[model samples]
Target chain A: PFLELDTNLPANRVPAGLEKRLCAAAASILGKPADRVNVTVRPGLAMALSGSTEPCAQLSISSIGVVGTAEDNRSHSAHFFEFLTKELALGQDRILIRFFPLESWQIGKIGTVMTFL
Target chain B: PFLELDTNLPANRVPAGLEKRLCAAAASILGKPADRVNVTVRPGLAMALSGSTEPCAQLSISSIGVVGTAEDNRSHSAHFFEFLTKELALGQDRILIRFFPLESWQIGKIGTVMTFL
Candidate 1:
């Protein structure tokens, strides 16, 4: 019933407008309605990329569906990172996105995901 | 080989000192040495507790051990939330903590521990 965008970015406080945009973006990508979406942006995270902070960011987005493939990751990354670059000036290289989608809450590798999902 | 405390608290710039204390608290509670513990505090999150923002917080503590019992949750909550209340001025009911221990890197049923939401 929700497409949650957990924006864990670095450096400075993220504006509310950006959070709204990201939530909408996530909703579009997840094929869910925007009204049912919730985006929580928390910035000023202290993280280093390749041993250097240098504008590095770690993004974790969890919704209830499908993911973890090269195509899927890049597809979502392109949309979100483009917005991040435009809004926050963070390059795609400095961003790492970890996506987890669970159909019926698969835990400990218990449930299956389709016919070879 | 390490304890990672990902603090997703809501406020205006949680001090690095508090982050350190939270990290140290996690180290003590998780029984890991403070030296090897890693705490990343990213503050100023936009969240709502029961339909109201009102300085609500959600903390995710991921370590390598046991969890999900009333006593374990309460003990950790008392220790950690006491620190938050002292440092951040948030009430115990306004803060929510979620713990994750990695063995299978599980995803089935997220077994969480808490007295508050």
Candidate 2:
């Protein structure tokens, strides 16, 4: 699973160790191994939501084997929103999380696409 | 259509007017009205590909009606790669474009989600 998080906050505001924290959170919430979770955070980007940009966030999560259903996504969304609220101080209404259920071919690693060997 | 472009290159390297250029390119290629296209660029990010922190880019395009099929993606990919190479000085291999065909309900505008009127 990969979590690509972007926020309108300044880069300096992104807490240290967020990558590891997010990775572990996703792994636990989505039931993936901690090692299989990858996270990237980009801050201080130009972003807007609801016709205004007042500290908003967008999280895109792509998973190969988890979070493929609405029930799963609903559960994951709650946990992630709670986590972000505590960590980033953003409200749920100001944050948007999009989920992508990917196939093996949709991702690449180590210079090769993931697939059954 | 929305094009979310993130690059490892410095913000100064993103050419002026690139947003308009990308919006126009996406509109023309995907047969969308130019006004409906949205483009966001985030630069100078810490990004890696294939275990290296090299100059790479990831473009995520989501559309309500365009670039859905494999053939459509193949054609759009070629055009986008060409455009990025000229504007951003990135090689084809260093750029990755992912397409998502979204439903109207998956998007929001003006404090309300898009839906059939």
Candidate 3:
């Protein structure tokens, strides 16, 4: 079984605001607005036979047409790294960014410790 | 920190009967037959929380592909405004019809609402 989370923020909170921030950061890095960027955060828990559950979080961020060039993925990756470093106050040692051209997905990793903070 | 809503109409309330009017209007506007046009509506909470939470109370009409240009967006917007104004007998200020570019996903807002209403 799978748990699903819909990204619609309610009347109390505006998703557009977050989108605006991400968009601005993305644009500053990649020269594109936030609308063209898609981000999703998925968290799940799996239980072992001992009944202990481990929490796992998956964060995905993708730009529709930013691949297929010698410098395209590199540029995008650098921008994303800068965005998280400044905005999230994360240091290079605390964050790990991976670029996968053939897989068509770019991922950022900060390890499980980052979740506590 | 967020509550969400889904946009799909229930099977029972598929909004029927809107196809006739919207297609009729589109045909009249584009000099084509009723079967030639298309219409669509997006159901979302961002649409809802924007205080733009206007339900699909009426039909959303358009032509899928017509003439040289897919004037469906413009045609649908105009048809919607006209529909609300003449049929609902509301002034232009009380309602607004906006259009986005031609997307591969074409949906009919009018007849879909009819199934519910």
Candidate 4:
């Protein structure tokens, strides 16, 4: 599982150990091992929502076996949003979570076009 | 159209005007107007591909039109990879580009779950 976090908040202000905490959160939420979960946090970037450049964030999760149904999405979204709201100091309204359920072929393994990923 | 770029390279090393250049490149490659394309560059993040943490990038383009067929994917992929290789100093092998053809409803606008994006 992989979680990509993007925000316009100050990168330097990010809570220390936030990335590793996110890994643990994602692993728990997605039912994956912590070591297998990858989380990347990119902050202090220019971002906008509804044409408004306010303090906001976008979290996208890609996993192979979890999150495809409505129940699954809402459940997982709640967990992630709760974690972010506490750690990142962002309201749930300012955070967007997108989930992608991928197939084996969707992820690259070796030096093909997929390797660049 | 939106292009989200994630890279493990140092963000400070990014070429000046690279973001605007990417906007133009994306417009040209996808046949969209320059003002209509949204590009976000997030560099200096911890990223891994195929278990390797080498210098690499992942570019994901989400658009409503202009890409779906095999020929179209290959053609557009070529253009983006070419531009990145020239500007970001990453080889085609080190960059991965993914395409998502979105539906109108797939994009969020107002205070919905999508607003966080």
Candidate 5:
């Protein structure tokens, strides 16, 4: 699993600094190698949060095992929630994050489906 | 669980016709209500599939239950894979999809953490 973030801003308008920062942060916070910490940033989305669409972001962070527990959520969120707010300029409450553990999903493959779960 | 798709095209570049079809397709395919099926399209994302980044699309499809299994994957792929390839112009191999079952996710809520697992 990798870390992916989606925002409503135009892709070209987003700050480039975020990619490196998020990758490093995920690696450190999730206790994974830097190379394995993948991040996909999608900009210019139609998003609605907190009854409004202004400055909202939808963050989907998934990993193959070892995270997304209630305790891990608290720890991982303290960084990203603020990181997105500070760096990305999204509203505090408008940032909706969903965590997916590896055990409950299927990642497609060339030969067959992955069963990390 | 909801249906979400991310693409390399710009948000404004996406045809508005897609939202309706996607909602209907996801609802029909996942066997859920029209309202319960949520779809978010994040455009202009930086994505890499099959070792190439050009015109790639990432489809993240998740549902509460009764979908995303191997049998379901093949069944569901028939529509979305071609749908994305036609509408979005992404290559067949360029489109990568991830399916998340509700059992492995934590969607945050008011005053508490959710554990569908």
Candidate 6:
């Protein structure tokens, strides 16, 4: 059975500077110093397809809006997956994860599956 | 009475390299080598209005279409006056003048006046 996580927090709960913090989190996951990776934001949800031979424990985040306005949105969704892949490849396990507002969170939306290889 | 010179020479009668030659002639008038002046061509007739008080013997040329096709045109009209001014200012008088096809020519259209300074 697969486990799903969901968040009910409002969009404005996160501080204004949370986007930079998310990028920093990605950098930490990749085992590289901050500024090594570039992160950008785009409108819409982020999704990915899986192949039978793909690596194990693939995590993807999408539609991870940071600011209330569309223009202020951060591209944290795609960066999250890239960070996980790079970090896991570098042999870092048991990584610490944080979600905005420190209140509620969600994962593994409908129609998306994560399989460990 | 101001002397009016008109040309009846066919545009084709002017050699292909006539633009360069005219520039060269202007240079000769200016008391400089042929390479000194820059010449170009434009479409439409060239005209200039005179103020109540201006330099004597002011000459202006415009809309000198060189080649039969507009695209192949060179900016020869404007350069003519520049050449004349430079040459006359340098104390060169009685400068030899040449027109294409070595034929008849016309000068001064309606509503225009040329005065000697």
lDDT per model vs. reference: 0.53, 0.76, 0.35, 0.75, 0.69, 0.29
Per-residue lDDT of model 4, residues A55-110, tens digit only:
88899998777878888888998898899888878777788988888644333222
- Give the proportion of true interface contacts each model preserves, from 0 to 1: 0.09, 0.03, 0.00, 0.05, 0.22, 0.00
Scored by TM against the true chain B, the candidates give: 0.70, 0.92, 0.38, 0.88, 0.79, 0.27
**Decreasing lDDT order of the candidates:** 2, 4, 5, 1, 3, 6
Instruction: Write the residue-wise lDDT of candidate 5 on B2-116 in tens digits.
Output: 7777776778778887877888877776677887667888776775443334566677787666655776666566667767777776566666667776653356556455673
TM-score value, chain A, candidate 2: 0.92
Winning candidate number (TM-score) = 2
Per-residue C-alpha lDDT of model 3 across residues A9-93, encoded as one tens digit per residue = 2323323343335545555565555333332221122322223232212123333344445587678657666665554443544
| Best candidate, lDDT | 2
What DockQ does candidate 3 have relative to the true complex?
0.02
Query: Against the hidden reference, what TM-scores do the models get?
Result: 0.49, 0.62, 0.29, 0.58, 0.57, 0.17
Sorting all predicted structures by DockQ, with the top scorer first, yields 5, 4, 2, 1, 3, 6
Chain A: TM-score in each model: 0.68, 0.92, 0.44, 0.88, 0.81, 0.26
Model 4 lDDT, residue A3, Cα: 76
Off by over 4 Å in 4: A7-9, A24-28, A31-38, A44-58, A78-96, A100-117, B8-11, B20-38, B42-55, B91-94, B102-117
lDDT of 2 by residue, A1-117 (tens): 767888998978877667678877887798888766656678888989777789988899988767789988999999999999888887778898999887654332322344422
State the displacement of the C-alpha of residue A5, model 5, in Å, after optimal TM-score superposition: 3.0
Q: Which scores better on lDDT, 1 or 4?
A: 4
Q: C-alpha displacement of A84 in model 6, angstroms?
A: 48
A1-117 in candidate 1: lDDT tens per residue? 122233345434455566556666676775666654444555665667757667655556655564647787678878777766667666677766677664321111101111222
Tell me how far the alpha carbon of residue B92 in candidate 6 is from the true structure, in angstroms, after superposition. 20
- TM-score of decoy 2: 0.62
Error of 6 at B61 (Å): 7.5
Residue runs of model 1 more than 4 Å from their true location after superposition: A1-13, A103-117, B1-43, B48-56, B59-101, B104-117
